[PDB]
Design an enzyme around this catalytic site. Sequence first.
Site, short mmCIF file in Angstrom:
data_model
loop_
_atom_site.label_atom_id
_atom_site.label_comp_id
_atom_site.label_asym_id
_atom_site.label_seq_id
_atom_site.Cartn_x
_atom_site.Cartn_y
_atom_site.Cartn_z
N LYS A 41 3.52 4.83 5.13
CA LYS A 41 2.76 3.55 4.98
C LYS A 41 2.43 3.10 6.31
O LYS A 41 2.51 1.77 6.17
CB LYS A 41 3.72 2.75 3.97
CG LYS A 41 3.98 3.44 2.68
CD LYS A 41 4.69 2.51 1.98
CE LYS A 41 5.47 3.36 0.61
NZ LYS A 41 6.23 2.26 0.07
N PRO A 81 0.74 -1.19 0.09
CA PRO A 81 0.08 0.04 -0.01
C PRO A 81 0.85 1.19 -0.01
O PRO A 81 2.20 1.30 0.33
CB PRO A 81 -0.79 -0.19 1.37
CG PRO A 81 -0.98 -1.64 1.90
CD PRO A 81 0.52 -2.21 1.24
N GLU A 82 0.20 2.33 -0.38
CA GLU A 82 0.94 3.57 -0.30
C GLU A 82 0.15 4.72 0.52
O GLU A 82 -0.91 4.58 0.87
CB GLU A 82 1.31 3.84 -1.97
CG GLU A 82 1.71 2.87 -2.80
CD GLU A 82 2.11 3.62 -4.15
OE1 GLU A 82 1.95 4.75 -4.29
OE2 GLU A 82 2.46 2.93 -5.07
N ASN A 138 4.83 2.48 -5.49
CA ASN A 138 5.31 2.19 -6.92
C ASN A 138 4.33 2.92 -8.02
O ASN A 138 4.84 3.31 -9.02
CB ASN A 138 5.11 0.63 -7.08
CG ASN A 138 5.65 0.09 -8.45
OD1 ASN A 138 6.56 0.62 -8.83
ND2 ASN A 138 5.21 -0.95 -8.93
#
Length: 283
Positions: A53, A1-2, A175
């Site tokens: 995060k 996750p971001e 990402n």
Amino acid sequence: PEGPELHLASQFVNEACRALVFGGCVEKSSVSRNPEVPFESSAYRISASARGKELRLILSPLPGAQPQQEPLALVFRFGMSGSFQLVPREELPRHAHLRFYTAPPGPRLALCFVDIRRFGRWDLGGKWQPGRGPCVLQEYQQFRESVLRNLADKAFDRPICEALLDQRFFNGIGNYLRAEILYRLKIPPFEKARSVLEALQELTLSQKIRTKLQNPDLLELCHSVPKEVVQLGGKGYGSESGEEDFAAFRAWLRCYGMPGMSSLQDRHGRTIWFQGDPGPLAP
């Protein structure tokens, strides 16, 4: 996750558990290799906060709660399938590894940390991950200054796309974000990180408007781009609006996993998406 997801998840927890009173112990599934949570209270409240995060739950016993219990903080890292869900007691998700039960006044609900792949993790205490820089969402100025102050660090010898994943300087960037951020400025993913940022190392508002407004730099977008997702996700996390939310996320994407866009592999095996020239440091 971001970054954005952790922030929205923290928002969901707070708005859902605002009036909720929890009681009893914190139950952990037997299969989970994560630590047990030494906590028991007849009445306690659950609040949440996000940074990068990571999500931090805080369990706070109400006045008069028994037995005696100090407030406890837990820091979570979701991983591939980690999530927080508020469900009816008799409808526990199959892979709920950490659960919080509500007190008798009202419907029986259960705040659960669901994670089928068990990549998620939590640690006792409220301390964030050591070495992680300021949150790009909540601590923009501290984030910007920290990067510029430490430009001489060896981390910026790396290509710009790899340095964006460095949580010591870009806490919250992952990402898909790095692909979207670099795409906006059309910066080659494999340019030297220091080269991209060297120019950035006091102007009045009128001066910023005339020169800085229509030309945002890399660090500015490191905050504003994930902020677009937050104001895109709305109050969708933890709701049934999952389908419509992801549809809006797909439409928002301009580069990541998009047709016509190029893709390479960094030194970590993570795929970087871009358009045109890869850069002088491309493998």
